[PDB]
Amino acid sequence: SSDLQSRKNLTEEISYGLREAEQVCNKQQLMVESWRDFLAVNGEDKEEDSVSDLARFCYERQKSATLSELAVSAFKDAYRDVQALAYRYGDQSNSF
Amino acid sequence: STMKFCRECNNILYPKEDKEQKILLYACRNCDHQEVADNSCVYRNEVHHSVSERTQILTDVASDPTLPRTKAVRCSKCQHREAVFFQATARGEEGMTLFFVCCNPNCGHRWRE
Amino acid sequence: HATPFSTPGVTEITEQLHRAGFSRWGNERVYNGRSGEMMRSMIFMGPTFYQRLVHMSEDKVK
Amino acid sequence: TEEELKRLYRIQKTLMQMLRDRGYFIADSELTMTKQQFIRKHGDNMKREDLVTLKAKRNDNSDQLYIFFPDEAKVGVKTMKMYTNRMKSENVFRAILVVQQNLTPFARTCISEISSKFHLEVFQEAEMLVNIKEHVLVPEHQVLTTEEKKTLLERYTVKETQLPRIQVTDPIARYFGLKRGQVVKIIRPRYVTYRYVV
Amino acid sequence: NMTYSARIKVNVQVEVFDILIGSIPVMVKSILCK
Amino acid sequence: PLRGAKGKTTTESYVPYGVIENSFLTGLNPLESFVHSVTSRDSSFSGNADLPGTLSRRLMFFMRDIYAAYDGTVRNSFGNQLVQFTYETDGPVE
Amino acid sequence: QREQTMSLYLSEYLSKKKHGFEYGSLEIKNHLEKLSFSEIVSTSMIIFSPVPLSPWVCHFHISEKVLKRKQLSAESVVSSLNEQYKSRNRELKLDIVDLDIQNTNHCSSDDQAMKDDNVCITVTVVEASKHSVLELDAIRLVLIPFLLDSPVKGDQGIKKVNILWTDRPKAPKRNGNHLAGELYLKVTMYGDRGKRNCWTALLETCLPIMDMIDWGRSHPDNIRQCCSVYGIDAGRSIFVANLESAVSDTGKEILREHLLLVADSLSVTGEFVALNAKGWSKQRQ
Amino acid sequence: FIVRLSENEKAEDYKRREKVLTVYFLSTEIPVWLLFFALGVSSDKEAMDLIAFDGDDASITNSLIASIHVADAVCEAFRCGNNALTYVEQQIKSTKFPPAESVDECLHLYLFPGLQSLKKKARFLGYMVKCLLNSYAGKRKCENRDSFRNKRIELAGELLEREIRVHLAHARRKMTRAMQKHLSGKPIEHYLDASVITNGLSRAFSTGAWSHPFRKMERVSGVVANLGRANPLQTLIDLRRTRQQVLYTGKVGDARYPHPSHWGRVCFLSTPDGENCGLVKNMSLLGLVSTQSLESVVEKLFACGMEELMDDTCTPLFGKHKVLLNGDWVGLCADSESFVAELKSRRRQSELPREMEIKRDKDDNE
DNA sequence: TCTACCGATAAGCACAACTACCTCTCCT
RNA sequence: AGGAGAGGUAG
DNA sequence: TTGTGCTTATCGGTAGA
Ligand SMILES: [Zn+2]
Ligand SMILES: [Zn+2]
Ligand SMILES: [Zn+2]
């Protein structure tokens, strides 16, 4: 970072990117046969239940292996963009 | 899978059928006591698949399969080829109709066939 | 103090080094000893703590 | 019943395709016969008897192969003895037997004992559902004659044992009706190779 | 190059109708150490 | 989930999954350091080191006898067995 | 190997219909997937109702929603149960002659009425003028596990079928290579009994749908037993493809001639021998 | 004392092979219900109340019914009289190496020595069966060998103790052999050999082969090591180490990975790399090992409000939490929170041993 | 109607569980 | 002079 | 302890004389 303000902006951007990646992983976890009624284009009143249950998604991911593979794949796909920020916040004289 | 204790000696009862009585009866071998049965129910078990206890977490039993993904279809809002397709019924329609869900993390669009 | 779970912030270290009269990033301008010309890029210098291991050269000669 | 009819239709089509590939002068009408035409020519019931036929080689009319379909599964020594007596009476040296279930060990020993006089080939009905030759993984197989085998051995100055080997139990060898001591030509999608049947 | 141990003494009585048993090595700065 | 189980039937096994927001420059949290140590403990094991050596030895014992002949064919040292009639290289020097 | 992974490719005539490949793959998955009877039934109970009929009739209650999701009917599952009872009939080594199953929308069961849209399946045991089946333990321990293990759909051999997408298949198509990325199905079958080949049982199960599965490119994923089905050359080609895939996954670059020489050296005697001492001894013998 | 749940294979036909509860006590294979009714229980309902499953599961009920049927078939009229005691006595006498004591005395000392009453041990057995059933149903988690909650470490008080015991036993054998050889045909100092134990200890300390905790033969290795004098740090870290013995070096399990139980006890960030990766764990700076307390804690527990265990098996517990001291059911408490708070307050006033763990869990209700 | 080898399952019984090097400490 | 038990280095 | 090959040993088995 050039100064402290740039460092704070980078920290906020990293936090928001991690939050977005976690949201993407949570969305990708729904691609199973159990949520076929919810993924269909119809009227479901349980839309808020899938969002408010934030602490259950991690527990469900840690128990299943296919869910874990899907989650890590989605996390890598969403974290490539986060890694791409180094060329924006990095100077040309950076040794790394 | 049901069990009860006769009020006489407080011991387990085994079900039996009598051709002459033509009714369900319970009598234990400890004492010569016979009592009438209730609801004519001798077995009632809820069917569950909890056979491999403490083993489904280590080995992936694949209880909930993942939905297939295709790349031939093309999304409308975005130009992404990867999408999830599955079959489900409608709100009031009959039969199975094909659905599609976009796999783009930034699109979030779903459409029917 | 350099407590592993109570490390001071990077800003504090930079301020401490700046108050000493040196660059806040730990790099100082150096000059080549062979030609005398000034190098274009500053070189980071610092008195780190090193150790000498028991493995020697003559102990491995066979 | 109709499922058995279409199963037998597929078996007959695959058998005719294999015979045409082996060069036994199979008519184009039998090769291009549709399912509806086969059913119409079948009648009410086949009884596993109308499939029995005799075919002769295209190059030589003396050589002929007779296809036998047993009436019931799990054939015994008596059925094999009747079949070989019929072959001796009809003066045929090759025959193809398509059975529903695996043969009796006594029947297998009887077949192996009389293999020197006449050559008998057994095929399961499940193996003839899909044509092995008509596949993208299987390359082109060409059977070399005695003169071509001698020319191949003389060109590279090698013996018959110093060649890549292929077992008789392989599906390709039984499809082409290859005996022990015959070489084949394989073209891969070009470099070619030869396999020795052992 | 000897063993730093201590002897064990316990009385044994025989009946009809302090002896030495063994030496245990002593850890340094133990309950019994100079 | 770190305290054995979350009580949602009692689980017995888990597949760890954690995201660390901090970096090495800022300073790792003790729980983050524990997570990193658990993740990186696999690379410090001595297992699976024998597999490449055993596989290489067993493949060498098979492919040692293969050599090219003066006639252009590929032959094995045992009995001059013909492995390949012609080398399948895509050029450029034979 | 017990998994015996298979590989089935779709035919070329399904592309004419709009979204034909997806519908065909879903139909094949629905037809060739094992669905146990226990996965559909929710509450199984035995009720004392009193060739003559025997007491201790069994009750199986199934919700209509489960049948709607699985696209099944009570008549269909009853017919499947009867067909599978008459197909093997090797178990149930007791005084049993016939087993008739009746379907009723509403049963005279006053024990519980929590579900109103659940259809009841009645199974009645028949005894040949004997009371050898009059006990409850025998039926509860033999017949109940037998019906729950009976699959209402698919075959007992097929374990699971998943739909996958690929761009570089092991068996390329002759023409039409412009199609970048096809859709195929991967089938896993049980290896409990080694008497019959898995491919042999798979060919018999796909008889009604022989036209849908493109048998010109379908091949087992295994290497050892593929030579017994399609010949040594097909096994060699699949082995070369798998070796190239493994090399690509390893990250290194290896020329083609090395892999071809390995394949030709490991299949010189007409069979793929193992890397152990027994394989080398057999190859030399 | 082992209670095993497995399919019955004795006097069982092909139709009946359901899971039953068996007891492996002194290698006798006694049915659980016979042992229940032998320990002062005369009713099936009382035995079921002792096993307070407090759940609705078909498998558990089927297993209990199968065990009852197996007990009924094994011994006829076992409920009436004392036929169960005779059956268990016969089973004990059927062993290859039966105890010298009778049946009336074997159940007091060889079966749950902590509980003096013959009916309290029946309640302890019922509690054990309840725990087993809860674990089988999935409500209770099973113990793991990687966690430090279920593991103990011994440095010198127990490692040298077993060596001293075995050397003393060998010396006693030699002494009695010499006495028998000399009596038929001397000071007491010549009878006892003073070199056997010293030579054995010297061999154990030199070769490093220590006696196996559970086997007479197959001496373990890696117990005694040499110090490093390259620098004081090496000799400081060599003294503070923890070793775990595994059957094979190629595979161990999950012990090679850190555990949340390592927080503040052993160092999870530093471990040797190689064959013993994770097996050798360095202790933390603030790490102490507890020692046995000579004071009696049972007398001080009743003063805080603990109520003694009920002797009669007919009286059930309503909401009284179980109090276990070193695996022994010492009594009951009305409220667990106030009880543990009072215990902690007493401990903080130097009225209790400073090395004592107080565990309160509402899931197990104990 | 009484014998032959013949299919799948239990139970021992084997080999194998990486190279290239360096020290010390204990026997025999 | 020869063997067994530990620790250590490099890929 | 495992992980696979490998050789005894027993359960039934259907077919032919
Ligand atoms: Zn009674
Ligand atoms: Zn889109
Ligand atoms: Zn009903």
Coordinates of N, CA and C and ligand atoms in Angstrom, one line a residue, chain B residues 6 8-9 11 28 31 33, ligand 1:
Chain B
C6 N -47.8 -57.2 32.8 CA -49.1 -57.5 33.4 C -49.1 -57.0 34.8
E8 N -50.4 -58.2 37.4 CA -50.3 -59.1 38.5 C -48.9 -59.3 39.0
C9 N -47.9 -59.6 38.2 CA -46.6 -59.8 38.7 C -45.6 -58.9 38.1
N11 N -44.3 -58.4 34.8 CA -43.4 -59.1 34.0 C -43.8 -59.0 32.5
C28 N -48.1 -63.8 30.3 CA -46.7 -64.1 30.6 C -46.5 -65.5 31.1
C31 N -46.7 -66.1 35.5 CA -48.0 -66.3 36.1 C -49.1 -66.6 35.1
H33 N -51.8 -65.6 33.9 CA -52.7 -64.5 33.8 C -52.8 -64.1 32.3
Ligands
ZN1 ZN -47.7 -62.1 35.1

